[PDB]
Structure formats: C-alpha cells, structure tokens
C-alpha cells in the first residue's frame, strides 16, 4: 500500500514497535511515517505511534541508514506516549484553537459519521489515536514537526466534561437536535453542587473567527470547500 | 487595519487580469513572414525552430513550431495558440500542428 502519494514516505506503516528493554510488548500499536528528510549524508525521520485507544506519541530519529532511523524513532516514540481523551471514543470534547510557533490549527468537534476532514498528516495521527469524527484547518506555515507538536499539545490539553463539572460544580447538560428538548446529563460534579446559577451572560465576550462566521452566513464561496472525497 | 479603515477603503479591488499574447482568445490566425531558429537560454542547448508571423490583429510575433520537422514557408497560413516555450525567452505563441498549411508531424 502507498502513502499520501506513490513516491512519498508519509502515511506508510512501519508495523508494531519492537518489544522494549523494559519487557513490554506493543503488538496493539501501529506506527506511521510522517516525514523523511536528508540531513547534509544522514536521514532524519519523524514517526508517530498509537494503539487506537487514546495512547499515541511521536518521535524524531536520526541515523545514517533509513531503517535504523525508523527503529530509533519508533522505539523512542513508544516511551513518550500521550493519553488523549476522546468524547464518546470517537471525537474531541470541544473546539481547540492553537498556535505552535507559526503554525495555526483549528479543530472542531463533530457528530458521529462526519469523518476525518483534516490535513492528511492529521488524519494519520487521528487514526492512530482513535478519533473518528473531527474537522481541522491548518494555517500559517505548514511545517510537519510543528504541526505534530501543536496537534499533540492541543489534544493533550482538552478539558473533559467531568473536569468542567468538577470545576464549576454544576451539571453539564447536553442538548441534541436529534433528541428534541430532552436534557441529557453527561457529567455531574463529584462533590457538592452549587445552588446559584451561572451568570446569564446576555452577550459573551468571546473571540470569534471570521472564517467560521463567514461560512455560517453563507458568504464563503470557495470552490474547494465541501468537495466529495474518499472515506477517511 | 481598523474597522473604520476597512470601511473607508472598502472591499479589495483586484486589478484587472493581464491579457496575454493571444489577447484573451483561444487561438489566432497568422501569416508566416519568415522562418528561423533560436538558441535556448543556457542550462540547455538546441536550435529551436521558430517563425515570425503577422497575426490577424496586425501585430507581428515570434512563435515556436513544435515537433520534429516542419515545412512552413513564407506567406503560409498558420493557427497559433498560447503556451510559453520555457527555454526561449520572449516566445509565448505556439503553432498548431495539423491546421491550415502546417501539417502533422511525419511518422518517425
């Protein structure tokens, strides 16, 4: 099977990580190549690993031979694993806007069946993590290492519903249009519950993105948005 | 810029697109005035077959003749399309093979 292109290393699987000197096996982990570069000769490889159940990581490996670089990167990646929280084990808990160096990433939580409409590297990393429904937009410099670092950083700093309930001492109630006006309580505080309601902010002072508002108002006209694509 | 500045300046005004050697037309008819060869710019070496043609618009222009072997002579009628010849600076018109006097490339 080919990667992102016929002649591209990116997206290619390297197989499970080798059994570690600690004695752990990683047969449930898959490895993917994100970047291969000639260092002036040696090779620097950026790879990502993940078990598809929230545990995922990435690493750089430098070696004169490509296979040695792959092995080094994979083995070092398995020992630097992030755990990524997933809402209902298919998507993220909330929208995440981040900037790592000069790379900006906007991530949007999506319902089931939406799929991965993301940068191809983000699609690979999401498949490794176990995220199945998400939207992502990458802006600024498209630098692969910065993209990976920013993605992992933002995904590792997402607040779960239980965390929000404990912080605010209130019920987190979900409203679904497909479920009508039925209130679904997704999280309740473990401790006592505050009896005073949250201030009913008549107009919140949030920082909006012109991109989202322009799309919502129908003034987006891009011929490249919402194109039909293969299942991801 | 501030919102007041954006309001005063208004929407961006994209400059009009520049018309090319064909003047925004798919093809152009032309009369061959003379045939000659030109040398590429130098990472490359060759003798590119070119012809000067008076177009239907009245302008005289240099065009490249693609393929191996041509039988174009003076006073012959050709059809020229767009497309730059990357090796030849200033040559932005290409003769269409198999139209009017310019015949298709002979096999082998």
């Amino acid at each position: 099977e080919r990667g992102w292109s016929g002649n591209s290393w990116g997206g290619i699987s390297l197989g499970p990580p080798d059994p570690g000197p600690c004695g752990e096996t990683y047969e449930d982990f898959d490895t993917r190549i994100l970047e291969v570069r000639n260092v002036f000769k040696s090779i620097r490889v950026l790879v990502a690993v993940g078990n598809g159940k929230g545990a995922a990581g990435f690493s750089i490996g430098k070696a004169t031979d490509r296979m040695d670089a792959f092995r080094k990167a994979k083995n070092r990646a398995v020992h630097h694993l992030h755990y990524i929280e997933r809402y209902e084990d298919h998507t993220i808990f909330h929208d995440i806007s981040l900037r790592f160096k000069r790379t900006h990433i906007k991530m949007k939580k999506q319902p089931k069946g939406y799929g991965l409409r993301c940068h191809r590297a983000i699609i690979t990393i999401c498949r490794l993590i176990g995220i199945k429904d998400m939207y992502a937009k990458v802006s600024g410099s498209i630098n692969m290492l910065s993209l990976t670092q920013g993605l992992f950083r933002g995904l590792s700093r997402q607040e779960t519903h239980q965390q929000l309930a404990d912080k605010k001492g209130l019920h987190v109630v979900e409203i679904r249009e497909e479920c009508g006006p039925l209130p679904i309580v997704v999280a309740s505080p473990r401790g006592p519950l505050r009896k005073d309601p949250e201030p009913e902010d008549e107009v919140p002072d949030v920082k909006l993105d012109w991109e989202d508002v322009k799309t919502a108002q129908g003034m987006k006209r891009s011929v490249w948005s919402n194109l039909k694509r293969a299942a991801t | 810029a501030t919102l007041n500045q954006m309001h005063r300046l208004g929407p961006p005004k994209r400059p009009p697109r520049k018309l090319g050697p064909t003047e925004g037309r798919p093809q152009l008819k032309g009369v061959v005035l003379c045939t000659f060869t030109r040398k590429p710019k130098k990472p490359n070496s060759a003798n590119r077959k070119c012809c000067r043609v008076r177009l239907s618009t009245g302008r005289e222009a240099v065009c490249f003749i693609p393929g191996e072997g041509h039988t174009l002579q003076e006073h012959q009628i050709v059809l020229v399309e767009g497309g730059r010849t990357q090796d030849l600076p200033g040559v932005k018109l290409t003769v269409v093979r198999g139209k009017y006097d310019c015949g298709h490339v002979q096999k082998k």
Partner: protein, 164 residues
C-alpha cells in the same frame, strides 16, 4: 480573529435576535446618553448592544445618538402624527429598556404572525414556475402525469414527426 470587543455584535444572527419591531407610527428615535455615571450604565449598554438590533429590524426609522448633553439619559420617539414619547432610562438595565420600548411602541406577536401569514399567501404552492418563485417548474414533475420527453421518450403516436 474578528476585530473589536464583542465581535458577536457584527453577526447577522445576533442582529436578527432583535425583538423590537416598531409600529408604523414611529419615524425617529433619539438616544440621549451619558458617557460617565453608574446610573446611566444600562443606557450605555443599550447603545452598545441593542441599537444595532433595533436598526436592523427597523431599517426605515431614523436613529440618532447624543452624548453628554443632559444630566440624565433618555429616549425620545417621534411619531408620524406629531406626538413625542419620552422614556427615562436611569437605573434601568438595557434589557429593561428593550422590554419597555417593546411594550409601549413594539408590534405584538399576534400582528407579526398575521404579517407572516399574509406573506405566505403570496407563494401559492399550486403555482408552477421557476425555483426562485415556485416549488415546481412543470406538471410533468407530478407523479402519475406524463413525464418530460427529456427523461422518458414519448411513444411515437404522441409525436408530430410520426403524425405528419
């Protein structure tokens, strides 16, 4: 991001959240308010948040604002008859001011629903025409009727080429 504080004010959805539709009598609304003083705070918010919505829902009403011309904020409405309505707005929040003006000079929900029902009659579902105005272009789109010859050829007996 969108420039300025409270960029949500510059979204059509917020602008359409407005619930004050003035009766046809109202021609001009002047808003006299003060830039400093706690007792005028709500009035300041009324200028910041609700005047855009009121103007959006009432495009033909002339809204004008005045600053630090009187010790107290107030609203004045000029009616077509020549009457003037004064609304004092000290100690009142912006929401309270909106409710007050809605009550005294705003069309009620019954009148608005009547207007929408009148608008509905203009687009008769039985008419056939372009998509911009009608649900269907032609009767052939109705099942049981003869469909387009473009999609289903007619039998030779119904074509003039075979009748002439």
């Amino acid at each position: 991001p969108m420039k300025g504080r409270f960029p949500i004010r510059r979204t059509l959805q917020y602008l359409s959240q407005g619930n004050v539709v003035f009766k046809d009598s109202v021609k001009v609304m002047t808003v006299n308010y003060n830039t400093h003083g706690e007792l005028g705070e709500g009035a300041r918010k009324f200028v910041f948040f609700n005047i855009p919505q009121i103007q959006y829902k009432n495009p033909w009403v002339q809204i004008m604002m005045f600053k630090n011309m009187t010790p107290s904020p107030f609203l004045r409405f000029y009616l077509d008859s020549g009457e003037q309505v004064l609304v004092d707005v000290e100690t009142k929040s912006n929401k309270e001011i909106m409710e007050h003006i809605r009550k005294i000079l705003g069309k009620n929900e019954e009148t608005l629903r009547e207007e929408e029902e009148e608008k509905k009659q203009l687009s008769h579902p039985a008419n056939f025409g372009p998509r911009k105005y009608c649900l269907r272009e032609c009767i052939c789109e109705v099942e049981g009727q003869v469909p387009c010859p473009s999609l289903v050829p007619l039998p030779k007996e119904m074509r003039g080429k075979y009748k002439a």
